[PDB]
């Protein structure tokens, strides 16, 4: 189950 | 034993030949269960293990939505990193991301991971405390600064300690026949003359799961660490693993040597003789 939020470098 | 869920993401810039490649794979322990490939027809998260195929359409729809959002983030990240390192748009670059969680034999949180590499080198890593960031250069310090300002570590921690562990438990239960199985090594020994004054003894471990194993040769009960050829544990391609260890035995000394096999599936370690 993937992380529901992503964060830009 | 202990267990893990891990996701592995590879993003490769292809300056001439179109959009960046994005590959995602998910593992429980040593078993792949999902993939996404930006270049494939489906544009879906796809099953790669029988036990996950039974997850319904809400699961697959949600994993597809999230893997595409991941893909888009990585597409921007390749541009950001180029900027940070003042690199031209000429070269191909690689961004890799890995995240996931370890549980102990009790299936309770042991450790979390969330970390990146750029062109094969550590870029930024969430430290074991899951509160702070390891950045080795000014590029990564820039990422670190933005992520400390937006409280990213707190959001990652809640996933790594909560969601990740909950879903790993669900997978271990739903995939019990695959994931909670122990396949003890099938062992054999071969003998092969190399000259008239020496021979190779090769100790084999085949068809084992999980991959973790210790295969060692002793001479008169002394570990032969420095004098053993040991191949890297390798996939058979049926979900099991293989390994061998070999020693060069001078004439008449075969009986001095013992092969020792340790694996989760061996109630007792094996000692094998020629």
């Amino acid at each position: 189950y993937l992380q529901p939020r992503t964060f830009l470098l | 034993g202990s267990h893990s869920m891990r996701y592995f993401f590879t993003s490769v810039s292809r300056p001439g030949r179109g959009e960046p490649r994005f590959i995602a794979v998910g593992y429980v322990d040593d078993t792949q269960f999902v993939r996404f490939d930006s270049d494939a027809a489906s544009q879906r998260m796809e099953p790669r293990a029988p036990w996950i195929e039974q997850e319904g359409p809400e699961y697959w729809d949600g994993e597809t939505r999230k893997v595409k959002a991941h893909s888009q983030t990585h597409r921007v990240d390749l541009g950001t990193l180029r900027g940070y390192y003042n690199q031209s748009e000429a070269g191909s670059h690689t961004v890799q991301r890995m995240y996931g969680c370890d549980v102990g034999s009790d299936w309770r949180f042991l450790r979390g991971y969330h970390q990146y590499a750029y062109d094969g080198k550590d870029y930024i890593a969430l430290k074991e405390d899951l509160r702070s960031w390891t950045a080795a250069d000014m590029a990564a310090q820039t990422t670190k600064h933005k992520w400390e300002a937006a409280h990213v570590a707190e959001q990652l921690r809640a996933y790594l300690e909560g969601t990740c562990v909950e879903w790993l438990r669900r997978y271990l239960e739903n995939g019990k026949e695959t994931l909670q199985r122990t396949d003890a090594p099938k062992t054999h020994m071969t003998h092969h003359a190399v000259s008239d004054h020496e021979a190779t003894l090769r100790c084999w471990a085949l068809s084992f799961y999980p991959a973790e194993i210790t295969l060692t040769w002793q001479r008169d009960g002394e570990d032969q660490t420095q004098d053993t050829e040991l191949v890297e544990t390798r996939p058979a391609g049926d979900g099991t693993f293989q390994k061998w260890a070999a020693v060069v035995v001078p004439s008449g000394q075969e009986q001095r040597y013992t092969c020792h096999v340790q694996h989760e599936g061996l109630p007792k370690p094996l000692t094998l003789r020629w």
Binding site: - | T10, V12, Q32, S92, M98, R234, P235, A236, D238
Partner: protein, 100 residues
């Protein structure tokens, strides 16, 4: 930029027995970057129907892939894995040995 040379192992899924169906594997590991060319060879000629695993990587960020094909070993047929990568001056050919 970082460039790491592939380790190569060529081996069968099952212990080889002449005239018994099996899988020929070429496992490539420890390489960077991920661009790599792998062929399975039968008596020096490229096998057409070769599959591979989905690209993954180890703790140290090095890539690994399994290339595989159905085969039935015989006494005389020779198999090999041929690998090219930016780290290699020439294609590397690793011969299959049924006891390695």
């Amino acid at each position: 930029m970082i460039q790491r040379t592939p380790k190569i192992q060529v081996y069968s899924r099952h212990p080889a027995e002449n005239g018994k169906s099996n899988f020929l594997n070429c496992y490539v590991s420890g390489f960077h970057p991920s661009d790599i060319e792998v062929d399975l060879l039968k008596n020096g000629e490229r096998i057409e129907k070769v599959e591979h695993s989905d690209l993954s990587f180890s703790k140290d960020w090095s890539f690994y892939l399994l290339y595989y094909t159905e085969f039935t070993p015989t006494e005389k047929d020779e198999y090999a894995c041929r690998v090219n990568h930016v780290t290699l001056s020439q294609p590397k050919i690793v011969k299959w040995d049924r006891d390695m």
